[PDB]
Copies of this chain bind each other. A is one copy, B any other.
């Protein structure tokens, strides 16, 4: 009954009904996880209806944004997000930490990767057409993000394989020259890589330089990915990986709790460590024990 209201309020566009929905989905308590799953399944059915009633075309554009600390991410999101909402867009910003004036904006929602897909789906369900996933670095959590988005963007300061677009930040005042230099270096680096051709642009949230041109290259990437069929192929691939991880997690809870498996596990771990048994043979044994 509670799920049905939080569902209705989220799909009607009420910000609080989506802010509580994400908190629910993020919970570790068993009863709260059961409520989150029911809610997510209602959203999944509706999400499928909305795309079918949009002639198979997706309803949002998922953007992954990353860079080092101090790159100018927060300042960029604030400028870029205001530019989006003013043009008619409803924008979500979801930060994922491996470690403003936009918060006052009625058309924007500002909130590891364990529930990120669930949050993306809740936002698309709520009616947002631009989902921005913000992260830090050039490593592990950054790779998980690239696999949850349509387009991956890198913000690199003035003072790369997976990136669809690279933006050289703070290209203002006495940092224009170093920014033009770093840009030249990245354009040079890409020209050597074997594969849309990733672009290197210079921006400034302080001056506004290159921000509109960035959004236009983003819309071009989007257009190409839809026309070529690569966007749906990528989403399909991403969906398979996500669905399988949800199913394998359920396969293992059911398996590790089964009384025969529980009862044999301690003895089996001892045998493996003492070098009396291999993990593969210990696993074969357990699988047979579960079956019989």
Residues of A whose CB lies within 8 Å of any CB of B are 37, 40-48, 98-99, 112, 137-141, 239-240, 242-244, 246-256, 265-266, 268-270, 272-276, 278-280, 282-284, 286-287, 290-291
Contact = CB atoms under 8 A, between A and B. Distances in A.
A41 B275 contact: yes
28 contacts: A37-B278, A37-B280, A40-B275, A41-B278, A42-B275, A44-B274, A46-B275, A98-B140, A99-B138, A112-B140, A140-B141, A243-B268, A243-B273, A244-B269, A246-B272, A246-B279, A247-B268, A247-B279, A247-B282, A247-B283, A248-B252, A249-B279, A250-B280, A250-B282, A250-B284, A251-B286, A251-B287, A252-B252
Given A48-B275, A140-B141, 10 more contacts: A48-B274, A98-B98, A98-B140, A99-B137, A243-B269, A247-B265, A248-B252, A248-B256, A248-B283, A250-B283
B254 A45 contact: no
Given A45-B275, A246-B272, A275-B42, A283 B251 contact: yes
A43 B239 CA distance: 41
A257 to B, nearest CB: 11
A8 to B, nearest CB: 16
A252 B243 CA distance: 15
A247 B275 contact: no
A130 to B, nearest CB: 22
Contacts of A37: 278-280
A245 B219 CA distance: 44
A45 to B, nearest CB: 4
B44 A273 contact: yes
Contacts of A254: 280, 283-284, 287
A242 B284 CA distance: 18
Contacts of A43: 275
Contacts of A284: 250, 254
A272 B255 contact: no
Contacts of A239: 269, 273
Contacts of A291: 290-291
Contacts of A252: 248, 251-252
B269 A247 contact: yes
Contacts of A246: 272, 279, 282
A240 to B, nearest CB: 6
B98 A139 contact: yes
